[PDB]
Ligand code: MH0
């Protein structure tokens with residue numbers, strides 16, 4: 528299930544982090560407006576760009592931390608406060624996170640792997656709820 532999926536993603540994190548974020552940017556091309564330096568690049572060119580690789584892996588590093596600290600796919604309130612407070616997240620509405628998890632769940636369903644996609648769906652919803660409580664509009 529969910530706990531084994533955290534280990535599976537961590538075992539090849541840079542690839543999963545990049546492939547899931549590309550899934551997200553290609554499903555929701557308007558989210559590029561938060562990522563001006565990614566506009567007008569193919570997936571292969573994005574994988575060539577320093578901030579892309581390094582920022583995507585740091586995002587997923589923290590995402591797997593928040594997943595690991597969760598109980599029954601409910602993140603800690605402290606982890607929601609961190610995500611809301613962070614300067615880099617000034618722009619952001621819960622909708623942005625909801626779209627990221629919609630793309631993450633679709634990626635997992637399309638893989639031949641026994642990912643617990645329902646758990647990730649619940650995780651995304653619960654994190655969105657936690658982000659709202661901690662004040663994100
Ligand atoms: C689609 C909007 C959006 C969503 C959703 C989002 C969701 C998440 N975030 Fe995070 N984040 C978003 C937009 C940004 C921006 C715009 C930046 C600025 C850095 C950059 O390189 O673009 C950023 N996030 C930056 C970060 C960084 C630091 C990157 C760096 O500068 O090296 C971390 C660790 C991070 N986030 C955490 C997370 C986690 C964890 C999640 C999932 C729960």
Ligand SMILES: Cc1cc(Br)ccc1O
Pocket residue numbers: 548578579582583584586627
């Ligand atoms: C800055 C950033 C945000 C998300 Br969500 C995914 C990857 C990435 O580099």
